[PDB]
Amino acid sequence: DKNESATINEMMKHLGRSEGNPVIGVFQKFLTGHPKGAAGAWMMNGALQILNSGIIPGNRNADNVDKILEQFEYVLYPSKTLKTDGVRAVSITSFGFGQKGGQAIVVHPDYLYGAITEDRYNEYVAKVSAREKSAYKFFHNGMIY
Amino acid sequence: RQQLQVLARYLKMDLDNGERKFLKEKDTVAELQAQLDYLNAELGEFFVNGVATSFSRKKARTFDSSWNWAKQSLLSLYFEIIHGVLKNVDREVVSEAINIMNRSNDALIKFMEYHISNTDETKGENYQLVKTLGEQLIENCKQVLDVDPVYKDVAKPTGPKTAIDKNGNITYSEEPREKVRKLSQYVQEMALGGPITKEKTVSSTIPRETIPFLHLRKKTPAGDWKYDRQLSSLFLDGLEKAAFNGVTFKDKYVLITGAGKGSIGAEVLQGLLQGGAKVVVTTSRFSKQVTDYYQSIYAKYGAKGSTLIVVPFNQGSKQDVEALIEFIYDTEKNGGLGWDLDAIIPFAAIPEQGIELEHIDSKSEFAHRIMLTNILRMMGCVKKQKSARGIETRPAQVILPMSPNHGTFGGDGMYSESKLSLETLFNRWHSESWANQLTVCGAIIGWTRGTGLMSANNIIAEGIEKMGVRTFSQKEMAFNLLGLLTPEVVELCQKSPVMADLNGGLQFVPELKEFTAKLRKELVETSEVRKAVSIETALEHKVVNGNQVEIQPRANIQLDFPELKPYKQVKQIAPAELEGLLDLERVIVVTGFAEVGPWGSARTRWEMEAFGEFSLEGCVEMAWIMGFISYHNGNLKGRPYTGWVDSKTKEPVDDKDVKAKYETSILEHSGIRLIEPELFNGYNPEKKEMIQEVIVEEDLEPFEASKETAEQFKHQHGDKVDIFEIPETGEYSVKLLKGATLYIPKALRFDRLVAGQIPTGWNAKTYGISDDIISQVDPITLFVLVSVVEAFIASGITDPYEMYKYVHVSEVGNCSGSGMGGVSALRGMFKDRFKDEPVQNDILQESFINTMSAWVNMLLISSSGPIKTPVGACATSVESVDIGVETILSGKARICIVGGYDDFQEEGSFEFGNMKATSNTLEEFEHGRTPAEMSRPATTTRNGFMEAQGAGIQIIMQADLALKMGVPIYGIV
Amino acid sequence: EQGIELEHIDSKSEFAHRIMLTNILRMMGCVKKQKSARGIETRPAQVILPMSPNHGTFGGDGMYSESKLSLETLFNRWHSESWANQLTVCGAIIGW
Amino acid sequence: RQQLQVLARYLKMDLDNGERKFLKEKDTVAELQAQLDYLNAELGEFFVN
Amino acid sequence: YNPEKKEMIQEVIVEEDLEPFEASKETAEQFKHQHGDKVDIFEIPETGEYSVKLLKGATLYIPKALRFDRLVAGQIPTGWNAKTYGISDDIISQVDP
Amino acid sequence: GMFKDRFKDEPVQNDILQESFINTMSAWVNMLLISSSGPIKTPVGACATSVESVDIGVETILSGKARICIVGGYDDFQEEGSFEFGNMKATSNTLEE
């Protein structure tokens, strides 16, 4: 936890993040524990859910944030869920035994649509809506049977 | 028997020694039991069980990270205002802004300034409002950077209100008071007094010949305590200042007992923390719920420089009292706090109801101990700690909770005896030698609505007030008490004991017991009469004249595809120059995802993560996952039925009833919890099997075996075993000899007892996986198969072959991986085979990290695309994403399955414990932690990770293909 | 109880408190129960309470003053409870 | 000793029964003594006696 | 490892009490925890060790040997040693071959 | 070590678990020789591991994430794997040979 906070803090410092604008930390493992290889995938799922809902879950087991982490000004450690008006990008980091460090950045899907024309977007929307209705039908049939 | 006796005598072995010793021991047991029975007959069960210790130093919980909670509060306020939840600057908003000012520093100012300068006021009125309110808040916070935090209550005062409906229903409400809408106005009201209390600063307004509702008393030469105008003026001026400017408790160390939720002490504690105090708060019900309650109190009210220490405590135990004070005064190197107390607030008490003089028994004696004897012991312990260190100039102010009614109501056991006995301290302060270490502040507490000691009387408070007397809310009484911690009253107490009358003129009502009983009977009678009359009128109507449909929710589980806006808004979000600038074959997007984990699927895990509890759809999904409920369509007990039935009893279950029926068991068998051996092939960390090699000292008794087995034994042992055919049957006798090696099972206690486990009852058959597969593959593979299928459902792809209508079979990849693969198959090969257990012949293939992906392709996908399986320990999933993105961008695939998975098994847990990577569960118990709090990232006390199990999968693909296929896009990688 | 100041209050002072207050209340209660089990309502027992005029004024007496001051609740409990027909209260403030 | 053991096994007599029962009783004695010690630490010798 | 004599373990239920054998107190308690009432452990007053006596019905494991029919492999040349290449023995004792 | 030697209470180093990971070999290579902070993608491809490794290294270099890569493969021979390969009848029976 110390290593990772320091790393994210230096990343932000070097890249000229605005002072007073810390990144909001999410620590999903408080609830699920540590799978040894599925961890990043669970985080990726959480990050997509965050992006599409705008809701940032709080670390409910963060009773007392360690004092040594106060030095990292670009990181915030919430203990309760926050309903924002929009999350535009999420960072995912993981550190594995054997010097396995990794990072991924996921961006809000709505930025994709700015790249296409209106007609293409509208045809996509129609196709997606039809597919979603079929998926619901299949899901509930498969669930009950 | 005679031959055995002869041998025993020859060997000098007394065959009856053990029985003799046992009979002596049984006599000793009877003696000790008689002593214990006598003590239980003298003291009673309640007392004996109640003096059990609760306090231990390792269970203390510290809260001091106000530097972080302030930014959390700011953000919560900011987004609530942006969302219209808070439309007006009501008292709660003002209180929040006060708590933010109490934690203000330069970094917080930068935080607020950044977030306000970057608020776009053009996006509707809520944004302009947040910008204006933020600018005011910033200006206020800049003023108090170097100023001490203050306790300052801004709540609207409330009075009692009881109403009786037409049908005689009794309801009590705390309505705001019409004339008093601030605490300053409240202090003015108190200073005025009333007709019943009749015989520049607020104290100028105290009328001639009337007693204020709150006042101090001075002891006369004859030794009676009488109202003193000057001292009361001091007290009321202090209260006036507190109401207007607030009051700081910086550098004050305080111990408070009896401050649980719903008590006056809880309000006193929050006031103390608002003013910057260092507070130790005790509790007789130490639990996760109580520690979370205090954590939230600190996060809300803890000002800069304030600390809260929560300890378990039984004030009824003298060893607890002594250990608690010792802990407070011990140096930190010695495991204590290193504090010196400036105040003790011993408000702990237990209820005595219906205990009249003749019922006084064990419980009343124990309550007397708590509320008087051990309070004197706590004072004594503090006096000894202070004197052992030669501290003579830092006295601790003791705020004694005194009562104005001694024996006036009856039925309260020894409550009144305890309360009246506390009053001796006023004189003992002068007659003994502890006055330099302790001061005495007696608070005669008045009628306080809402406590465990007075709640049953809220309904007559209005009539009592009609008599011209004042009852108090707990917030008001806490404000009164905190008035006794101001510097002026503190100096006054150091001069001589002070007695504060916070009774609101109730002492002027004569025959109080009869008056309150009359009020209560009036109300009860009115209620009962009205109810009876209404019932009879209704029945008469129903006989003379003779003889709404409600709809229950049904769970409607949604897939939750991303919402798609109109092209106009979506065009507004990204730069106008982005159109046609990007090669959408080079943009990777996530079109579906899924997981199998300790909280079920990704839908239920997210509900638990974001909201802390399950909706109806989440509860039904968890019940179905865990096998509690199953669907039925047909005749059930003859009648047709379509819906959920209990899986075991087959009785119908309505969706609305799923929570009540199952939620408690769902929560008990989900998430981080004690390891359940049935989920891990009988693995029990409390009894871990081992084998110990022992050299045989004497020949064994022969045992039978088949010829092949016997030859294997002979091959192993050589001449240290004898095998002989049995002519009759053809079997063999096996006789191990001296010097032969043997293995004796022994058991070990392991201290890792908790893990994140997939919910009990989870079964791949529920998802539709046949049992030939289930018996073939390692369990991790079942987690992956379910996750891949669900991920494709989240992508809207129900038949994976649909992929081949858009891409070639060489363009669908699988880049998912694992840290360890099929560890259960590894156990098979390395242990089960070593013990000659039945192990499937192809077990080895089922252990490979890449076999999970092989089965995914062999059962669902049928692609001939890239297959790159990473192994990255705990970063496997991120490595998997990196590889899948590289594969798609290299043109080798247009769709990829990425993700990760791992299982939990005995050997890995033991080895993680040997490396000390995971949290020791016995140590966690020693600190009072339950399984649901052992995973606490980023906290002061974190000490090891919690092991879990499951799988997570995502589908990624080129954005161009995703658009063409019309699959949902959840994010861009 | 001699030389027992506030910080010395221990086993002996707790036992003395039991004798001089708690078990006096228990003795009153026992008499009340015996009288009521036999329906005796017109023959009250006068309890002569040994009270003290100095509560905490001298110090060093353990819980003596607490016991003595606590006995004074009975003046009011006689009126607030249901044992007044079986017991009466006569408080004697004994002098030097 | 070996002959005595053979006889004891033939007679089905457990030579260690008494010691087993005694060790259990000694555990019980320790439990009760711990309870009494706790009451004496909470109440003090003067009160208890 | 010798493929001609491959070690295995066979579970056998004890038919008659074993001869007592000595063990340290912790080991004896582990045996008692495993076997419950099918073992008797008694402190030896003189030394503080314990006697362990397995009883009828207790489980035991008897080594047995198996002949495997894979006897040949491509092996790195006999005498190959990482020290010859310069790898220190702290590494050699730390890592897997 | 973990599955058998520990089960028999043999002396096994406390960090044995880290030494079993497929990616620990590459971790030691970096920790003793290379000291890079470049990509580390460890494939597991049974008998096609080395070819998968080449594919990944080429993709990594062509993606611009690295300009040099160590590729290749490795595996050991031990008793349990030999037995299991014989049970699957993948290897040649030596007695038959």
Ligand SMILES: NC(=O)C1=CN([C@@H]2O[C@H](COP(=O)(O)OP(=O)(O)OC[C@H]3O[C@@H](n4cnc5c(N)ncnc54)[C@H](OP(=O)(O)O)[C@@H]3O)[C@@H](O)[C@H]2O)C=CC1
């Ligand atoms: N209510 C009123 O109007 C008046 C109150 N008082 C006095 O003021 C004090 C305040 O209590 P009040 O606010 O009324 O609410 P309560 O009297 O209900 O509060 C007492 C608290 O003590 C704690 N407690 C109980 N047993 C123990 C124990 N063995 N060890 C440690 N703590 C224990 C409980 O909290 P938890 O279970 O959370 O630990 C409980 O909430 C009392 O002493 C009372 O006699 C005097 C006059 C009037």
